Design an enzyme around this catalytic site. Structure first.
Site, PDB file in Angstrom:
ATOM      1  CG  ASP A   1      10.377  49.033 -11.560  1.00 31.63           C
ATOM      2  OD1 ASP A   1      11.366  48.307 -11.800  1.00 31.63           O
ATOM      3  OD2 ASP A   1      10.072  50.023 -12.263  1.00 31.63           O
TER       4      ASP A   1
ATOM      5  CG  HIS B   1      11.135  47.452 -15.055  1.00 31.81           C
ATOM      6  ND1 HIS B   1      12.158  48.039 -14.340  1.00 31.81           N
ATOM      7  CD2 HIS B   1      11.268  47.892 -16.329  1.00 31.81           C
ATOM      8  CE1 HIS B   1      12.885  48.789 -15.149  1.00 31.81           C
ATOM      9  NE2 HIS B   1      12.367  48.717 -16.361  1.00 31.81           N
TER      10      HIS B   1
ATOM     11  CD  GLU C   1      15.329  50.416 -18.696  1.00 28.17           C
ATOM     12  OE1 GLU C   1      14.734  50.201 -17.618  1.00 28.17           O
ATOM     13  OE2 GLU C   1      16.270  51.231 -18.800  1.00 28.17           O
TER      14      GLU C   1
END
Length: 646
Positions: free
Chosen positions: A187, A258, A320
Site C-alpha cells: 500500500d 496505493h 481509489e
C-alpha cells in the site's frame, strides 16, 4: 446439544449415549489413498496434542470393542457437494469421518473438535480427568459449504504484524472453516514482500518514520518508526501452514493506486513520487500507466509472487486511483490519452488493468481486483466512465457503490465476491457494523436473477489496519464479527438463526480465550428486538397501563405442554424504563409458578427475561401471565411482552 460454528448443513440426532474418546481409542483408515492417510496423520497429531490421548494410527480392522475408534472413510457419494463436503457418523460404536476428497476430512476434524470440551485448546493443565464426549448423543452430520469463497483479508501494509500473529489468525480461520486468506501486503505506507530483483522495495518501502494515529486527519502522530516485511522463505512457510488447514492465500499487490511505498523505492514508477514513505494514511500515489518501464517492473514482481504463491488467483487491487490529484493535467497523461483516443481517466486505468490482466494470464494466473477495475467512477475523483471493457475473466470484489453496478458486472460475465464495505469492513466500529449486521449480510445481491446467482462465489471480510497496531487490537476488531461471516459463507441461508448463533458464539468464545484471541467482550451476549420477530406477543405496556403495577396477559392458547416458558418484557420507546418485580403463571385463578427477580427494561436491558414452570396443562383451564412492574421515575414508557414455549 451441538454447537458448531458454522452451523452444519444437515444434522440428525438420535437417542442414547454419545461416542467418547479414551486412552484405548484408535484412528483407523479404511483407504490407502495417499491424501487421506496424510489427513489422518495430522488429525492424529492435532487430536492427540489437544486431548492428551495416544490415539494411534492402526490399519483397517484393528478396532477394539473396548473403546470407540475414529474411522476415516473415502466416500464418493458426497462429490456432488464439492471437495469440502464431509459426513460424520458418531455413536458409542465408532466415529466415522467420510469425505469424497481429503479436504473434507480436515473440516470433519474441526467439527469434531467443536463437539468436544473446550479445554482441548488449553495449553496447560491436567486433562486426564476430562470426558472426551463427542456432543451429547449419537448423531449423523452431512455438511458442505454454501459458498466456495470464504475469505478474510489481513492488511499488513498499514501495520506489519508478522508470522506469529498471522498463523494465529489462520488457526481461527481454519477452526471456522474459512478457506481464503486475502493477504494485503502492499500500500502507500508499506511494502511487505521481499523481492530479490528489487531490494529497495523492502529496504526502503518497508520502513517509515512514524504513523498517524486516532483517525484520519487527526493531527496526531506516534513519532515511532515502523518497519517489517516477510522474506520469501517466510512466505513459503506460511503458504504451507495455511494449505494444511484448507486455506488458500490470495496475495494483493496494490496497483495502479496505493503505490507510494513502491514509488519511493523506485521513483520512475510514478509521475508524482513522494519524498519519503508517507506517514499519514490518506496519501495515495499512483503508478505511471503511460510508461513501458512500469509494466516491465510489475511483471517482474509478479514473477516472484507467482513463484512463492501457488494459488491460481492474484489480486492487484486497483481501488481509489486519485485521478485528479495524480493524473489530471499531467502532460504524459494528456498526450497518452489523445494519442490513444481516450476521453476519461477511467479509460487510462482500464488500459492499465487490461494489460495487467494479460500479463497475469501469461504466468498461468487469474486477475482479481476491486470493482473500480470494472470501468465506472465510484470514488468521485473525476475519472468518468470507461469506454473499453474489462477482460471478462477478471474477478471483481465489490466493496463500494450501488449494487446495481455489481449486478451489471455479473451479467457481463464476471465472477464476483461481495465485500460491500458498509457490511464487511471489520476495521469499522461495532456501532457502524454491529454483530447483527454482519450475520445478516447476504452475499447474493438482491434483485439478481436466479440464473446469475452462480457468479457470486462468496464474500470477503476486511481488516484494514490504519488504526490497528497490535495483535490484541487486531483481535478486537476482527472477532467476533469474523465468526458471523464464517457462518454466512458456509451455512445454508435457510438454516441461519441469529439468536441461536449468539448462543453458539458464547460457547465458541471459550475457545477464543484459550487460544489467546482478545475478541470484543461486550458484543457476544446481546438481546435484540429481532430475536422476538417470530415470537408470540401476549401484550404491551403504555403510559395508560402503567397506572397499574399489576398486569394480566392471557396465554391459554399458548400453554400446550409442561416445561420452561420464557416471558420477555422488551422496552420499545419512551422517556422512562420499567422496573420489574416479578412475573408469574396462573392456572385458572391460582398461582403455579413465579420468577421474582429485579429487572429493568429500558434503553438498557438487565434481567428482562423471566422463567415460568408450566405444569402439564389442565384441559379446559385458563392460563394467565401476571407481571408486576412499574414505570421507573415516570410513565412515558412503551414495550412489548413476549412468550416463548419450550
Amino acid at each position: 446439544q451441538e454447537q458448531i460454528i458454522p452451523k452444519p448443513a444437515e444434522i440428525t440426532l438420535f437417542t442414547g449415549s454419545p461416542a467418547r474418546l479414551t486412552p484405548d481409542s484408535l484412528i483407523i483408515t479404511e483407504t490407502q489413498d495417499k491424501a487421506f492417510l496424510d489427513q489422518a496423520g495430522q488429525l492424529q497429531q492435532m487430536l492427540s496434542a489437544g486431548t492428551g490421548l495416544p490415539l494411534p494410527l492402526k490399519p483397517a480392522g484393528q478396532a477394539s470393542k473396548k473403546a470407540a475408534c475414529i474411522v476415516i472413510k473415502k466416500d464418493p457419494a458426497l462429490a456432488a457437494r464439492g471437495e469440502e463436503a464431509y459426513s460424520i457418523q458418531s455413536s458409542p460404536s465408532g466415529i466415522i469421518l467420510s469425505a469424497a476428497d481429503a479436504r473434507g476430512i480436515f473440516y470433519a476434524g474441526q467439527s469434531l473438535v467443536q463437539m468436544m470440551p473446550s479445554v482441548f485448546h488449553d495449553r496447560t493443565g491436567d486433562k486426564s480427568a476430562v470426558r472426551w464426549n463427542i456432543s451429547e448423543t449419537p448423531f449423523r452430520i452431512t455438511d458442505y459449504p454454501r459458498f466456495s469463497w470464504r475469505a478474510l483479508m489481513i492488511d499488513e501494509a498499514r501495520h506489519f504484524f508478522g508470522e506469529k500473529t498471522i498463523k494465529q489468525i489462520i488457526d481461527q480461520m481454519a477452526l471456522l472453516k474459512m478457506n481464503i486468506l486475502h493477504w494485503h501486503l502492499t500500500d502507500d505506507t508499506g511494502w511487505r514482500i521481499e523481492i530479490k530483483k528489487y531490494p529497495r522495495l523492502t529496504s526502503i518501502g518497508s520502513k517509515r518514520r512514524e504513523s498517524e494515529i486516532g483517525t484520519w486527519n487527526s493531527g496526531k502522530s506516534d513519532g515511532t518508526p515502523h518497519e517489517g516485511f516477510y522474506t520469501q522463505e517466510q512466505i513459503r512457510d506460511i503458504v504451507q501452514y495455511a494449505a494444511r488447514r484448507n486455506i488458500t492465500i490470495v496475495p494483493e499487490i496494490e496497483m495502479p493506486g496505493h503505490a507510494s511505498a513502491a514509488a519511493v523505492a523506485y521513483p520512475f514508477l510514478s509521475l508524482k513520487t513522494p519524498g519519503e514513505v508517507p506517514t499519514t494514511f490518506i496519501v495515495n500515489t499512483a503508478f505511471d500507466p503511460t510508461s513501458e518501464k512500469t509494466y516491465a517492473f510489475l511483471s517482474d514482481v509478479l514473477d516472484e509472487v507467482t513463484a512463492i504463491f501457488p494459488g491460481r488467483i492474484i489480486h492487484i487491487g486497483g481501488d481509489e486511483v486519485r485521478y485528479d490529484k495524480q493524473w489530471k493535467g499531467v502532460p504524459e497523461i494528456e498526450e497518452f490519452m489523445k494519442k490513444n483516443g481516450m476521453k476519461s481517466y477511467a479509460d487510462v486505468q482500464m488500459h492499465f488493468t487490461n494489460r495487467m490482466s494479460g500479463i497475469i494470464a501469461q504466468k498461468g494466473r487469474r486477475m482479481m481486483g476491486w470493482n473500480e477495475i470494472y470501468g465506472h467512477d465510484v470514488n468521485g475523483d473525476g475519472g468518468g466512465k470507461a469506454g473499453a471493457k474489462l477482460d471478462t475473466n477478471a474477478v471483481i470484489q465489490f466493496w463500494k457503490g450501488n449494487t446495481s453496478l455489481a449486478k451489471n458486472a455479473i451479467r457481463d460475465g464476471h465472477d464476483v465476491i461481495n465485500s460491500l464495505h458498509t457490511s464487511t469492513y471489520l476495521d469499522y466500529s461495532y456501532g457502524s457494523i454491529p454483530l447483527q449486521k454482519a450475520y445478516g449480510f447476504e452475499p447474493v445481491f438482491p434483485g439478481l436473477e436466479k440464473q446469475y446467482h452462480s457468479r457470486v462465489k462468496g464474500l470477503g471480510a476486511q481488516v484494514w489496519t490504519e488504526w490497528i497496531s497490535t495483535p490484541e487490537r487486531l483481535h478486537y476488531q476482527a472477532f467476533p464479527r469474523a465468526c458471523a461471516f464464517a457462518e454466512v459463507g458456509w451455512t445454508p441461508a435457510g438454516k441461519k438463526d441469529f439468536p441461536d448463533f449468539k448462543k453458539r458464539l458464547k460457547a465458541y468464545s471459550e475457545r477464543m480465550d484459550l487460544m489467546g484471541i482478545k475478541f470484543a467482550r461486550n458484543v457476544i451476549s446481546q438481546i435484540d428486538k429481532s430475536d422476538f420477530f417470530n415470537t408470540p406477543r401476549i401484550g404491551t405496556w403504555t403510559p395508560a397501563t402503567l397506572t397499574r403495577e399489576e398486569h394480566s396477559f392471557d396465554v391459554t392458547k399458548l400453554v400446550k405442554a409442561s416445561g420452561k416458558h420464557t416471558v420477555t418484557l422488551l422496552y420499545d420507546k419512551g422517556a422512562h424504563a420499567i422496573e420489574i418485580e416479578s412475573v408469574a403463571l396462573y392456572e385458572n385463578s391460582r398461582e403455579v409458578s413465579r420468577d421474582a427477580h429485579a429487572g429493568r427494561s429500558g434503553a438498557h436491558k438487565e434481567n428482562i427475561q423471566y422463567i415460568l414452570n408450566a405444569p402439564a396443562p389442565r384441559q379446559g383451564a385458563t392460563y394467565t401471565v401476571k407481571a408486576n412492574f412499574k414505570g421507573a421515575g415516570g410513565r412515558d414508557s412503551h414495550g412489548t411482552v413476549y412468550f416463548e414455549t419450550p
